């Protein structure tokens, strides 16, 4: 019924109250010290006082760094932002790599705002323009005022708008007899639909029909919102939302990512600090996950060691799969985990350890229960032996085809014959490499 | 339309117990690979497991693309099947991760259920009122049938759909409310007014009976990438066709993911997972393989079908050399279907099926000669020689292609090995790798 | 008759569950039987209000982008509006910069150099450079020879707006390519046309894929005006940026004149029709849902956003012959929101706190919402929140002679934990 995405078995770090790790909780098997360190990091996030703290989840494949990052995200909650990333994301053909890095940095930092908006809404009973005096002159608009009659329950008001408001009014094609919604903060207006006081069974435009809006007109409504700092930056750089010709023309163009200047970021920070001190804003710093950090070259790391030392930069977590390898972008620096020694002093290494046979067997059992296929004990032991012998991942991916073969065999039980048929149909990396070695057709 | 290299494969040739038949659905051979491909097909048809990488391995001229295209044929309509190649990723407007993400979003489909309304009747009277500049329009349309008559209001789109493909009083039209389509079925009243401009009068139809408004529910399929680009900009519907969409932000991605899950839980949308097929996946780069190994771990990721014809070869962008050109971390994620070379009976069945699909009456001895040629040189050469031999037989005015046509075609056109020997025999005539040549006979 | 239905947690309910489950150290307090035991109590009522339904404890308001503005607000026979949205970022400039670089001045050389570089030495000037203008007049077939000087000295948006429909000279070298002839031959073409249907696939894809009824999926989070520029002590800057933000040709081009106004100049003021300032050039959005970023709160999203109200409206769709009652202590006396729900959309004959005698004369008016010998109702829906069946039995004791039980459950929430301990107690 529900699709499994190789991580649905993970619900949290599974720690106890004192920071110790239960052996089985949240779909985690083993990795006790890694889980405790990640829980300490989660507590450090919920402290919400630090800036530019970084950790590296060192370890081999099939070990659980990515699992630990999503476990951190599950434990932290969807209110605090989490920005997953891959190292190949940072290379863009439209803007510099470093600006993509800082854009992800300010995607990570969140904000909690509560704003009051002046709102005009009601049914349009009257809509009469006023003509201008000199229409063909063209240095003024063709109208001067528009009188609008708005009616709702308990209140009724007449509205003498500026022509610039009537621009948006005509752009939403407002007719007489529909319920509209003027937002006085930006001048935007939304046409809800035709009012249901009249007949609603004779239109041809599949319009939605709405009752009269409750409450008076000039409703002042307070709403709560969650936005990121990057979204403020991209709204102020590409100013869509006003009712001036710059904003109306900026809606129509195809947006390109531009190098957002630092001055915009200081102005946004000053405005946000005023919102903090005024009392409607509360900062929510977040967590940014750069997976496959070996793929980043020397320029990103060189900029990263300066970008982490700012007052606002979030906590970034890093994953590496390689050991003692050369850094990309250079040809002489040989460094652990593909990470230069300049960055590694800022970095707090969290090691992860490989698995035993029993841990692999329990992981296969929980992954089979999450994928809603029940297994036999000898077949589970066989899959555990293959997981020790080939890899954990190959034993994980083979679970669904033997289930398919089981439904083919008109039974719900997985037997060892299904496992042997999964061995015979599909191959791991090692047998494929040996088959490449014996053949001369460059198979 | 036209006959291509893969015209003959109609299905995977597979029985209901997931066992391949020897020769069915336009396929032969590769019994274990056919069984594994059917298992992957049943996995897709279940549609509850996401991001299972499947790799196909084998020598060239073995049937890898034939296997994948048979999977696409037996996969059924209205379920997405992208067939990208490895070289198409490297663009000047997208990033490679962005191009992979767009292929991923193209591969996954949404079956939107929509409620519509059909009206069909005899048109009574049109009352289109327009402004002086013609920009703003409002009208009243009046339509009847044998039973009852209704007066409807008009909007901008319906009036402009009445203007183009112009409708007069006396016509029978059908309007769909959800799509806004206008289908003039014909002229029924046959009115006495005949303007000299109208020369195209539609055919007479009986005016319809029964109620005008008939309830109807229809389903239409739209992929995730199309919804993504539609919500991306103001004019997004053009960017499907011009392809000027690019570097789309992650915000619209996550918001559309939430909205898609919303439409799923209220019953509007039924997600069907698809298949992304990347032919010649050894052509890709190491950054692309990094994004691929980190991109299958989402719920909105399809079954990825990969193909290679390389041995232990160099992984691109990197100094080292890896099995199939694919790195070890990606190779561990994938599960490998293997393919093995053919023999004389399977090759004979291949050319017989091809010549049946190539409408060529081939004689039996010429078929034996073509099989010996195919085993001797390659399957593709003996596949290609059939149409040429047919043309040569057409030039000699005999329908049946005989042995002398095959020998003349073999003499006229060269295969790989004979061309290699002919180059090696007199290499001074051709331009050398060092750019040296002799263009004079003396 | 006893029946039980169990329900899956909906998406917004599950995300509210997670965001208020996180806290700092909750230690799963409500399913640690804190409601059974007797701050813990605040987490217990928070988990209960989340686990029932969101709108029973905060209103799902409108969906709008965050207005990054500093507009004229109030503290709370017509009330009038002027558009006064400004960005909070004020870029302040000195007056020396403007008055010594941009505006002309007696000691400045802006206007002199502007004319000297744009008129005296423009290569499209026919007064100095005739043969080049005649060269392009032969090429492009332009009727007027000053048109190249006009095009070379006009802003791009303005030059786009005053687009001329006049055909060129017929002896020109402008040879119309076959694609332009294809586009012009189908400019007003009917259906059932061979060249007509080849050259519109976007309208076919529109009508086939039902794009006229699709919904808005994305709205921006922050919308802003352009950043205001604030020069102190000059009105010329105010006039200039007010003219540039609201140029009447550009604003009127993205506009439409009202119909009775077009009556007024065309008939009453006698203005010729082609001398109207041109309008209607704003691009049409894809749908009515794509016009504006503000999303109204939908009634159907209230119906479908709950784990239990969805199956509840399914059940009262199925249940017609028996009047039924709801134990409203699943949310501790929340009558209001279910009241709005079932007289907004699922309207029925209803009674809620002479009261007990109204539903027995006829079963067309259901007993509906009461807070817990009136067993004359045909049935009662008492469903969950019972970690003790004593109040359950005392509620069903009050309750025709037949009694029917309708039990509701949500999996993954606290109802499985209190309703697995109390299940063995029954």
């Amino acid at each position: 019924v529900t699709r499994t995405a190789a991580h649905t078995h993970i619900k949290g770090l599974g720690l106890d109250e004192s920071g110790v790790a239960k052996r089985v909780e949240g779909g985690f098997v083993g990795q006790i010290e890694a889980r405790e360190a990640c829980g300490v990091i989660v507590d450090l996030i919920k402290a919400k006082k630090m800036s530019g703290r970084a950790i590296l989840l060192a370890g081999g494949p099939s070990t659980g760094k990515t699992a630990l990052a999503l476990a951190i995200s599950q434990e932290l909650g969807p209110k605090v932002p989490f920005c997953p990333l891959v190292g190949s994301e940072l290379y863009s053909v439209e803007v510099k790599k470093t600006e993509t890095l800082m854009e992800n940095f300010r995607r990570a930092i969140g904000l909690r705002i509560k704003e009051t908006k002046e709102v005009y809404e009601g049914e349009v009973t009257e809509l009469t323009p006023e003509d201008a005096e000199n229409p063909l002159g063209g240095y003024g608009k063709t109208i001067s005022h528009v009188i609008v009659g708005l009616k709702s329950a308990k209140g009724t008001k007449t509205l003498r708008l500026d022509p610039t408001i009537y621009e948006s009014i005509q752009r939403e094609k407002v007719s007489i007899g529909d319920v509209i919604y003027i937002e006085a903060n930006t001048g935007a207006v939304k046409r809800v639909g035709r009012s249901d006081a009249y007949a609603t069974e004779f239109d041809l435009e599949t319009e939605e029909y709405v009752p009269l809006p409750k409450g008076e007109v000039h409703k002042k409504k307070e709403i709560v919102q969650d936005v990121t700092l990057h979204d403020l930056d991209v709204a102020n750089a590409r100013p869509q939302g006003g009712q001036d010709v710059i904003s109306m023309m900026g809606q129509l163009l195809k947006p390109k990512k531009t190098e957002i200047t630092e001055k915009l970021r200081q102005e946004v920070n000053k405005v946000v600090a005023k919102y903090i001190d005024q009392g409607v804003a509360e900062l929510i710093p977040g967590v940014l996950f750069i997976d496959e950090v070996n793929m980043l070259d020397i320029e990103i790391f060189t900029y990263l060691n300066k970008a982490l030392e700012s007052n606002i930069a979030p906590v970034v977590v890093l994953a590496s799969n390689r050991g003692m390898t050369t850094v990309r972008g250079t040809e002489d620096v040989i460094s652990p985990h593909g990470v230069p020694p300049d960055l590694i002093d800022r970095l707090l290494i969290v090691r992860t350890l490989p698995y035993d046979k029993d841990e692999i067997r329990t992981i296969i059992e929980r992954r089979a229960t999450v994928e809603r296929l029940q297994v036999e004990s000898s077949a589970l032991d066989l899959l555990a032996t293959m997981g020790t012998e080939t890899s954990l991942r190959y034993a994980l991916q083979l679970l669904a085809p033997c289930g398919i073969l089981a439904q083919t065999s008109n039974r719900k039980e997985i037997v060892v014959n299904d496992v042997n048929e999964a061995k015979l149909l599909f191959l791991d990396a090692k047998r494929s490499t040996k088959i490449l070695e014996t053949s001369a057709n460059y198979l | 339309s036209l006959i291509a290299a893969h015209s003959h494969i109609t299905g995977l040739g597979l029985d209901e117990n997931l066992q391949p038949r020897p020769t069915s659905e336009g396929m032969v051979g590769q019994l274990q690979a056919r069984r594994a491909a059917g298992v992957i097909l049943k996995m897709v048809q279940n549609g509850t497991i996401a991001g299972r990488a499947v790799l196909v391995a084998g020598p060239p001229s073995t049937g890898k693309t034939a296997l994948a295209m048979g999977v696409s044929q037996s996969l059924g309509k209205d379920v997405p099947f992208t067939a990208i190649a490895g070289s198409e990723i490297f663009s000047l407007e997208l990033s490679k991760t962005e191009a992979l993400t767009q292929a991923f979003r193209k591969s996954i489909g949404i079956k939107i259920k929509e409620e519509t309304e059909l009206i069909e009747g005899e048109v009574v009277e049109i009352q289109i009122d327009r402004s002086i500049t013609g920009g703003h329009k409002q009208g009243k349309l009046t339509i009847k049938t044998t039973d009852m008559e209704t007066i409807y209001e008009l909007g901008n789109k319906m009036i402009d759909g009445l203007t183009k493909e112009k409708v007069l009083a006396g016509d029978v039209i059908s309007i769909d409310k959800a799509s806004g389509k206008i289908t003039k079925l014909g002229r029924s009243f046959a009115r006495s007014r005949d303007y000299d401009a109208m020369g195209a009068d539609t055919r007479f139809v009986q005016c319809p009976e029964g109620e005008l408004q008939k309830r109807k529910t229809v389903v239409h399929t739209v992929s995730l990438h199309e919804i993504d680009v539609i919500n991306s900009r103001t004019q997004g519907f053009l960017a499907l066709f011009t392809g000027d969409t690019g570097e789309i932000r992650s915000e619209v991605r996550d918001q559309i993911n939430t909205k898609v899950a919303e439409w799923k839980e209220e019953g509007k949308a039924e997600i069907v997972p698809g298949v992304l097929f990347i032919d010649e996946v050894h052509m890709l780069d190491i950054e692309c393989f990094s994004f691929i190994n980190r991109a299958l771990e989402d719920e909105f990721a399809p079954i990825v079908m990969m193909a290679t014809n390389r041995g232990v070869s160099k992984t691109r962008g990197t100094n080292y050399k890896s099995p199939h050109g694919l790195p070890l971390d990606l190779l561990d994620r994938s599960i490998i279907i293997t393919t093995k070379s053919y023999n004389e009976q399977e090759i004979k069945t291949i050319l017989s099926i091809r010549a049946q699909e190539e409408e060529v009456e081939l004689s039996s001895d010429a078929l034996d000669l073509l099989t010996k040629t195919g085993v001797e040189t390659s399957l593709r050469y003996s596949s290609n020689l059939i149409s040429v031999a047919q043309q040569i037989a057409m030039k000699r005015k005999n329908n049946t292609v005989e042995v002398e046509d095959v020998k003349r075609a073999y003499l006229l056109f060269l295969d790989s090995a004979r061309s290699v020997k002919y180059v090696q025999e007199n290499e001074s005539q051709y331009i050398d790798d060092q750019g040296n040549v002799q263009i004079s006979i003396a | 008759i006893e029946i039980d239905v169990l329900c899956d947690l909906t998406q917004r309910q599950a995300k509210l569950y997670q965001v208020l489950k996180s806290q700092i150290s909750t230690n799963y307090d409500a399913i640690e039987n804190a409601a059974t035991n007797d701050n813990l109590i605040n987490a217990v009522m928070q988990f209960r209000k989340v686990c029932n339904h969101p709108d029973l404890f905060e209103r799902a308001d409108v969906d709008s982008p965050f207005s990054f503005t500093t507009f004229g607000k109030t503290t709370s026979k017509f009330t009038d509006l002027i558009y006064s949205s400004r960005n909070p970022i004020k870029y302040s400039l000195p007056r020396l910069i403007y008055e010594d670089l941009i505006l002309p001045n007696y000691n400045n050389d802006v206007d002199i150099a502007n004319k000297l570089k744009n008129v005296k030495f423009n290569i499209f000037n026919p007064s100095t450079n005739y043969e080049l203008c005649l060269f392009l007049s032969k090429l492009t077939g332009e009727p007027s020879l000053n048109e190249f000087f006009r095009v070379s000295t006009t802003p791009l948006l303005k030059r786009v707006i005053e687009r001329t429909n006049g055909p060129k000279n017929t002896d020109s070298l402008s040879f119309k390519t076959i694609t332009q002839e294809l586009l012009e031959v189908t400019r007003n073409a009917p259906s059932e046309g061979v060249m007509a249907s080849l050259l519109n696939v976007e309208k076919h894809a529109y009508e086939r894929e039902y794009l006229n009824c699709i919904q808005r999926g994305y709205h921006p989070n922050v919308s802003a005006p352009p950043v205001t520029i604030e020069v102190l002590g000059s009105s010329h800057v105010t006039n200039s940026i007010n003219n540039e933000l609201f140029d009447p040709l550009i604003s009127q081009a993205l506009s439409d004149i009202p119909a009775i106004t077009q009556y007024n100049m065309h008939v009453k003021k006698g203005i010729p029709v082609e001398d109207f300032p041109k309008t209607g050039l704003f691009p049409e959005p894809l749908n009515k849902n794509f016009s504006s970023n503000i999303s109204m709160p939908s009634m159907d999203r209230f119906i479908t956003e709950s784990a239990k109200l969805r199956k509840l409206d399914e059940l009262l769709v199925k249940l017609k012959s028996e009047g039924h009652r709801v134990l409203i202590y699943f949310q501790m006396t929340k009558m209001m929101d279910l009241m709005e729900e079932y007289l907004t959309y699922r309207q029925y004959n209803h009674i809620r706190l002479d009261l007990v005698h109204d539903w027995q004369t006829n079963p067309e008016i259901f007993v509906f919402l009461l807070s817990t010998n009136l067993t004359a109702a045909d049935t009662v829906i008492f469903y969950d929140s019972d970690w003790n069946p004593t109040i359950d039995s005392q509620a069903m004791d009050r309750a025709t002679r037949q009694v029917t039980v309708y039990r509701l459950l949500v999996r993954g929430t606290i109802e499985e934990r209190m309703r697995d301990r109390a299940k063995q107690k029954e």
Partner: peptide, 28 residues
């Protein structure tokens, strides 16, 4: 009681009228 039809403000407009016998055009 059946709700009234929506008001039809068409003042300030030309008129295309097509009927069974003959087609009109009212202009300004």
């Amino acid at each position: 009681f059946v709700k009234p039809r929506r008001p039809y403000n068409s003042e300030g407009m030309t008129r295309i009228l097509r009927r069974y016998e003959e087609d009109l055009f009212c202009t300004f």
